[PDB]
Every structure is written in structure tokens, then in C-alpha cells.
Amino acid sequence: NKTVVVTTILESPYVMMKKNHEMLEGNERYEGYCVDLAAEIAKHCGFKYKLTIVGDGKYGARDADTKIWNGMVGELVYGKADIAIAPLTITLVREEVIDFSKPFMSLGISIMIKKGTPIESAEDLSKQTEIAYGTLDSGSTKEFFRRSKIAVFDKMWTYMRSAEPSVFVRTTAEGVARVRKSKGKYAYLLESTMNEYIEQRKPCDTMKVGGNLDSKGYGIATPKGSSLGNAVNLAVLKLSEQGLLDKLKNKWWYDKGECG
Amino acid sequence: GANKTVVVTTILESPYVMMKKNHEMLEGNERYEGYCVDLAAEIAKHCGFKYKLTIVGDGKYGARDADTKIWNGMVGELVYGKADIAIAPLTITLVREEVIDFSKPFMSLGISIMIKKGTPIESAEDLSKQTEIAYGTLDSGSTKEFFRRSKIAVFDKMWTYMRSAEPSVFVRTTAEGVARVRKSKGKYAYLLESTMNEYIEQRKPCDTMKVGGNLDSKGYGIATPKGSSLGNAVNLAVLKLSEQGLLDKLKNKWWYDKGECG
Ligand SMILES: O=C1CCCN1Cc1ccc(-n2nc(C(F)(F)F)c3c2CCOC3)cc1
Numbered sequence: 001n002k003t004v005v006v007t008t009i010l011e012s013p014y015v016m017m018k019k020n021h022e023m024l025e026g027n028e029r030y031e032g033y034c035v036d037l038a039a040e041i042a043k044h045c046g047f048k049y050k051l052t053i054v055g056d057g058k059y060g061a062r063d064a065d066t067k068i069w070n071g072m073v074g075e076l077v078y079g080k081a082d083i084a085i086a087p088l089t090i091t092l093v094r095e096e097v098i099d100f101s102k103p104f105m106s107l108g109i110s111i112m113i114k115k116g117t118p119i120e121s122a123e124d125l126s127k128q129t130e131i132a133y134g135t136l137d138s139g140s141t142k143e144f145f146r147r148s149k150i151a152v153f154d155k156m157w158t159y160m161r162s163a164e165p166s167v168f169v170r171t172t173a174e175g176v177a178r179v180r181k182s183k184g185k186y187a188y189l190l191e192s193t194m195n196e197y198i199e200q201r202k203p204c205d206t207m208k209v210g211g212n213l214d215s216k217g218y219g220i221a222t223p224k225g226s227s228l229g230n231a232v233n234l235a236v237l238k239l240s241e242q243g244l245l246d247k248l249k250n251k252w253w254y255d256k257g258e259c260g
Numbered sequence: 261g262a263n264k265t266v267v268v269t270t271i272l273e274s275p276y277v278m279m280k281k282n283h284e285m286l287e288g289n290e291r292y293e294g295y296c297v298d299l300a301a302e303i304a305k306h307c308g309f310k311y312k313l314t315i316v317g318d319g320k321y322g323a324r325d326a327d328t329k330i331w332n333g334m335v336g337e338l339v340y341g342k343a344d345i346a347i348a349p350l351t352i353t354l355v356r357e358e359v360i361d362f363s364k365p366f367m368s369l370g371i372s373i374m375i376k377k378g379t380p381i382e383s384a385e386d387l388s389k390q391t392e393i394a395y396g397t398l399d400s401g402s403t404k405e406f407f408r409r410s411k412i413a414v415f416d417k418m419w420t421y422m423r424s425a426e427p428s429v430f431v432r433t434t435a436e437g438v439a440r441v442r443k444s445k446g447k448y449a450y451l452l453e454s455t456m457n458e459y460i461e462q463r464k465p466c467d468t469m470k471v472g473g474n475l476d477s478k479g480y481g482i483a484t485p486k487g488s489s490l491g492n493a494v495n496l497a498v499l500k501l502s503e504q505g506l507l508d509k510l511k512n513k514w515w516y517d518k519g520e521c522g
Pocket residue numbers: 090091103104105106107215216217218240245364365366367368369477478479499502507
């Protein structure tokens with residue numbers, strides 16, 4: 001029995017520092033949906049664990065030239081963590097190098113605007129130039145646009161990849177701040193889960209517009225062939241069927257909502 | 261050894277698999293059409309196998325008998341070696357995952373309520389608090405098991421009612437449940453997956469609707485026998501087809517493009 005090293009990422013409301021974190025130690029420093037989920041998964045699988053925050057603050061992408069993975073995916077691939085418990089999107093390129101559990105949450109790519117921005121859809125963004133728009137770096141949303149051969153999305157990528165100044169951001173928090181401070185001239189493409197959370201937080205000045213652009217899931221990731229993968233997968237299904245995943249979503253999204 | 265034709269188990273459930281109007285003068289896989297027929301062709305293409313569609317003999321999804329411990333339905337066909345793969349609206353569940361493998365999901369769904377239009381019901385809570393309107397589920401499937409196992413008060417109350425209701429509120433097929441809603445003048449509501457509910461909502465005579473939120477959140481997966489050689493490739497194919505947009509295209513094709521209610 002060794003202590004399982006969990007890689008995760010500071011991303012609200014999945015993993016956040018507690019208000020009084022500087023007087024706390026180890027796993028107790030953190031709170032959120034994924035902190036609660038990690039505790040449940042560990043209990044059902046019978047392991048002790050240490051939450052670590054991913055060194056480079058990234059989800060994970062492969063460098064096209066060196067072929068080296070960064071982010072949480074890299075931490076699994078290179079043996080620096082035993083499991084990733086985070087809002088980590090299940091994707092084909094990742095499933096080729098790590099294992100994922102069945103999904104614990106559904107999501108799709110979505111559009112965040114400052115309230116009153118005259119945009120209702122992806123189509124709307126693609127047909128104009130007044131309002132800039134971008135995505136997170138080193139994540140699945142950027143890759144979605146990079147690979148899409150859907151007319152509207154391909155046009156969006158052509159604009160985004162060459163836009164000056166850069167429309168990409170290092171963290172979700174940076175993307176949201178950019179929307180909030182840009183007086184309606186920046187829209188942000190991000191996962192519906194994070195969009196819907198921010199929509200219910202003060203100062204209540206953003207909103208999700210239009211339908212989701214795709215439909216996918218987050219999964220708990222382990223290194224290819226790991227001894228933990230089987231148990232973790234069954235634990236996710238058990239938590240789903242018990243209603244625990246629904247309980248946690250309600251706890252962290254809507255019970256804590258502050259826009260009424 | 262040499263490549264063998266893959267036996268695919270599936271179920272006659274609209275719009276996933278249906279008999280073509282002219283099926284008697286067609287052969288083999290060409291007899292059938294639907295979302296799962298289109299998906300099977302794509303999975304087969306991408307994984308590089310030839311296949312034969314077969315309809316599950318007992319017309320069931322899959323449950324384990326309490327007494328005999330024998331699995332029926334498509335799950336049983338995989339467990340007992342009669343089929344190599346199931347391509348169907350088969351729900352990923354823990355009890356099934358213990359005996360077969362599932363791909364990552366190809367379609368999201370949740371348990372939902374179907375009413376005859378005008379029935380004074382807006383929620384599961386509403387059903388649970390009243391007695392004039394009967395309600396039930398497919399008699400062997402993941403929806404029945406959901407209610408059987410739920411520790412949530414509203415759903416426990418519903419199960420306590422359904423399990424003891426006479427005459428039986430359970431049905432043998434989705435089609436039977438839908439017909440029961442339609443003929444019962446608002447006095448029967450049917451608990452079924454959102455996917456099937458939304459499909460029927462777009463079918464003549466346009467007299468049913470889905471009401472309230474979904475009761476749970478889950479998915480359908482492509483299933484293979486435990487440790488099958490096909491599992492890895494099938495899973496990658498699902499993710500590829502998801503990412504390209506094929507799954508969205510197929511849902512629109514079979515649900516909404518051919519909808520009969522505007
Ligand atoms: O809320 C929850 C918790 C338990 C599962 N659940 C609902 C759910 C259902 C399906 C998905 N997923 N997950 C994926 C994928 F694996 F990421 F590709 C795909 C879908 C649907 C479309 O096909 C791709 C994701 C979530």
C-alpha cells in the first residue's frame with residue numbers, strides 16, 4: 001500500500017484553495033467538486049492519496065515538434081502522478097496514451113459573453129470582426145477548433161490562429177477576466193460546465209449564449225495499464241448510480257450560486 | 261487466425277434499428293435501417309471488420325435473473341458467447357460493466373416521463389404524490405433497475421407503488437408502453453429514456469410529450485464480451501466518430517430531420 005499521487009488543477013469550482021488555506025496542510029488546503037470526488041473515489045477503491053496541483057497549470061497537449069506531453073496528461077505519461085482527478089476531457093489523442101474512466105460529467109464547448117453583447121451563436125461570431133474571440137491554451141477546446149472541418153468552426157479557427165493580439169489565454173480565469181474587462185469586444189469559448197458556474201457568480205455580468213457546439217465528458221485518468229484503472233472506473237459508475245455525482249454538481253454549482 | 265465475420269447483437273427499437281419497408285426482398289444487413297444500423301457500418305469500417313446484424317432472440321436488453329443468475333437479452337448474448345458485439349441503445353451500468361466491457365458512451369440520456377398531452381403531471385414528484393394516474397417502466401432494463409435500487413425518497417416511493425401495482429404497470433417493449441400512454445386518456449404515464457421519449461414526441465399522432473427534467477444522467481455504450489480483442493479499437497472508433505461530428509449528424513438524421521410533428 002503506497003499513497004496515491006493525484007494530479008489536479010486549480011479550476012473553479014473543481015479545485016479551489018480554501019479561504020483559510022495558509023493555516024491548513026496537505027489535502028485539507030483544498031475544496032471543490034473534484035476534492036469531494038477524490039475523497040469518494042479513494043474511499044470506494046480503498047487507497048490513501050495526496051492531492052498535487054499540476055506543475056505547469058495545464059490540462060495537457062502534445063508538442064508537435066518534440067512530441068512531449070505537458071499538463072496533467074504529461075504527469076501521468078511520464079510517471080509523476082498516479083491518477084488525474086480533474087475536469088479533464090476524454091479525447092481520442094489522449095486515450096491513445098492514458099486511460100480514462102467512464103465519464104463523471106457531461107459537457108460541451110460553449111460561448112461566454114459579457115451581458116448585452118450582440119452575439120447569439122458560433123455562426124454570429126464567425127460572420128463578424130468587431131468582437132474578438134478565443135480559447136484556452138493546451139486543452140481540448142483549442143484542439144476542437146484546430147481539427148474541425150465544420151464550416152463555421154473552420155472559419156473561426158482560421159481567424160483565431162492568426163489573430164493579433166493573441167486571442168488565446170493561459171487559464172480559464174484569464175479568459176473570463178478578458179470577457180469582463182473588454183466592454184463586449186471579447187467572447188470566450190469554454191466548456192459549458194465552467195460557463196454555467198461563472199454565470200452564477202458575482203458580479204453576474206457574463207452569460208452563456210447559444211447551444212453547445214459538441215457533446216462529451218470528463219473522465220478520471222490513469223497511466224496506460226495502471227493497477228487502479230479498473231477499480232476507479234467501477235467507482236465512477238457506482239457514484240453515478242447512487243446519485244452522488246448529481247449531489248456534488250448541485251452542491252458546487254447552484255447551491256453556491258450568488259446571482260439569485 | 262483468419263478474419264471472421266463479427267456477430268452483432270442488436271434490438272428492434274425505433275429509431276435505432278427498424279425493418280425496412282421492403283425488407284423481405286433484401287438480404288442480410290440490408291434488411292434493417294436506423295441510427296444503430298448506420299453506426300454499426302461506421303464502427304465496422306473504422307475497425308476493419310465484416311459483420312452480421314442479428315436481432316436478439318428474446319427481444320430484451322439484459323438483466324440477471326435473481327434465482328437462476330442467468331443473464332438474458334443482449335447482455336446474455338455477449339456473456340454466453342452467442343454474439344461478439346452489441347450495437348444498440350444499451351445503457352452503461354455497474355452490474356453490466358462487471359460482466360461485459362463498454363466503450364465510452366456514444367449517446368447521452370436520462371430517465372424521463374412521457375405523458376399523453378394534457379396530463380396534469382410536471383415531475384416525478386407529481387407522480388409520486390398522486391394515485392389517479394398509473395405509471396410504469398420497461399419490465400426488464402436499466403430503468404426498472406434504477407427504481408428498484410434508488411435510495412432517493414421520491415424514486416423509492418415510486419418503486420414501492422410500481423412493484424405492487426395491479427394490473428402490472430410494466431411493459432414488454434417500449435412500443436407497448438407508448439401505446440399504453442396513447443390509449444389511456446391521461447391515466448398512464450411511461451418512464452423511459454429521454455432519447456426514446458424525444459423520438460416519439462416527433463412522431464404522429466403527436467399526442468405525447470416529455471415533461472420535467474431527467475431523473476438521472478448516463479450513456480449508451482457499445483458492448484463486447486469481457487477482455488475481447490475488439491474492445492480497444494471499438495472505443496477509439498467511438499471517440500473518433502464523436503469528435504468528427506458523426507454522432508450528432510446521426511441523431512439529427514433519425515430524430516429531427518425526419519420528424520413528423522413540424
Ligand atoms: O453525467 C454523467 C455522469 C455519468 C455519465 N453522464 C452522462 C454522460 C453521457 C455521455 C457522455 N459522453 N462522453 C463522451 C465521450 F466519451 F467523452 F466521448 C460522449 C458522451 C455523449 C456523446 O458521445 C461522446 C458524458 C456524460
